[PDB]
Amino acid sequence: RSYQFWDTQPVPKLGEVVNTHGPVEPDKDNIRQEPYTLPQGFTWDALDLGDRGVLKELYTLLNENYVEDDDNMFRFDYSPEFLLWALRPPGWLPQWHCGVRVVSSRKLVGFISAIPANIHIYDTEKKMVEINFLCVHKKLRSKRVAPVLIREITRRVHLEGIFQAVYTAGVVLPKPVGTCRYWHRSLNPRKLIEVKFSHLSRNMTMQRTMKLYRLPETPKTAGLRPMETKDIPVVHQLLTRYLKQFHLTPVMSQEEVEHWFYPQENIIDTFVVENANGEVTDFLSFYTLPSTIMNHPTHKSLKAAYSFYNVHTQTPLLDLMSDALVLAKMKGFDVFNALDLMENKTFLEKLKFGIGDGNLQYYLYNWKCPSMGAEKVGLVLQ
Ligand SMILES: CCCCCCCCCCCCCC(=O)SCCNC(=O)CCNC(=O)[C@@H](O)C(C)(C)COP(=O)(O)OP(=O)(O)OC[C@H]1O[C@@H](n2cnc3c(N)ncnc32)[C@H](O)[C@@H]1OP(=O)(O)O
Ligand SMILES: COc1cc([C@H]2SCC(=O)N2Cc2ccccc2)c(Br)cc1O
């Protein structure tokens, strides 16, 4: 209906059709110097994630209070080392790791983050931030703390001369530039049925289901191997060229490519295809993000892989993703998740992905442009 907070923000209204390209409002020439006021008993604290104790406090906040499915059965369980990967890419700033603490106990009860990103949106490239990890402790919910967090990070980003942002959320807000759907590929169908993520259908037995989802023990694509340091430039080249075909994409430097793709166990996997000539022609990537399974006596966690960026020039995408599934299965993953963005719709149903509940909406702050189909979205966030 109406949005008490979002109606005040430089975003387009829901329902309106946009036929133009540009900022909702001009760059601000002076910026509020003072932090926005929090409710009594709470205080701002920029979190030094290089401090092990502090990073663990953030881990705990998110582990207990971050995104849950609509049925409150699963919650994201970002690891401390994943958080460090996600939150300290090239150009990261300490003031952009924005925490809220209880004054008396010092308990961490809120967080929001910004990281810098160059973003290509239709015919324009803009320096932006990506906003992520917005979280308010369950005990502080529905107390309008989130608008304060959003305004405060906005202010801190403005101070650095940045006036646009990109973000995703499961909720519908003014106004999505793209709407995506999560799809899931069962790797361990037994466990997934046991924990009620998926259901054993009427026309299939467990024996049939396990047979349906059974995968080869090793990948089939010739010359597929983990990305190494020597592959950083070619991965950068391949990615840059591949992304041109989409309408919302990152523009990554070679240093950013090293950060986002160089393999780190239990965080990010990247495999390249090195052909018979020694040329790298393709790559696949996926990140590691487990979920907590709540209120279960025996199964406490679900290990999930998330499709990241997959670039093909000589190996068909279908083959690359088949190998991604096999590699994920080998590494002990229970499920493989992918969005319906980029060219993913060409392989999702073929490789036995099932559609998930809920949407992932893509948003831009202070940028008005026509909305795009999922197939034109070429940006994947953590
Ligand atoms: C130039 C720089 C710009 C930088 C900033 C760019 C914008 C970035 C924007 C943020 C990008 C975040 C990206 C991610 O991290 S998406 C992940 C979000 N996190 C979670 O879902 C974790 C679990 N949930 C919580 O912690 C929450 O309940 C939160 C913190 C989400 C809301 O806390 P609470 O439940 O206690 O509610 P409130 O009473 O305080 O406040 C209610 C208001 O908040 C609006 N709301 C609710 N959910 C979201 C949401 N996910 N994005 C934007 N707005 C949201 C809601 O419509 C209402 O406004 P309005 O309806 O009255 O208008
Ligand atoms: C349960 O329905 C889904 C929930 C999620 C998110 S919400 C909290 C969480 O932990 N998830 C990761 C997960 C949990 C379980 C299976 C696969 C992925 C996603 Br993304 C897509 C779904 O369809």
From Swiss-Prot:
One GO CC annotation: cytosol
Binding positions (tetradecanoyl-CoA): 4-6, 133-136, 142, 144-146
Effect of residue 67 to L: Reduced glycine N-myristoyltransferase activity
Catalysed reaction, written as an equation: N-terminal glycyl-[protein] + tetradecanoyl-CoA = N-tetradecanoylglycyl-[protein] + CoA + H(+); N-terminal glycyl-L-lysyl-[protein] + tetradecanoyl-CoA = N-terminal glycyl-(N(6)-tetradecanoyl)-L-lysyl-[protein] + CoA + H(+)
Membrane topology classification: Peripheral membrane protein
Main location: cytoplasm
Biological process annotations from GO: in utero embryonic development; ketone metabolic process; N-terminal peptidyl-glycine N-myristoylation; positive regulation of establishment of protein localization to mitochondrion; protein localization to membrane; regulation of opsin-mediated signaling pathway
UniProt keyword list: Acyltransferase, Cytoplasm, Membrane, Phosphoprotein, Transferase
EC number(s) from the headed UniProt entry: 2.3.1.97, 2.3.1.-
Intracellular or extracellular location(s): Cytoplasm; Cytoplasm, Cytosol; Membrane
GO molecular function: glycylpeptide N-tetradecanoyltransferase activity; myristoyltransferase activity; peptidyl-lysine N6-myristoyltransferase activity
Organ and tissue specificity: Heart, gut, kidney, liver and placenta.
Family: Belongs to the NMT family.
Protein name: Glycylpeptide N-tetradecanoyltransferase 1
Protein source organism: Homo sapiens (Human)
Gene that this sequence comes from: NMT1
Residues shown, of full length: 115 to 496 of 496
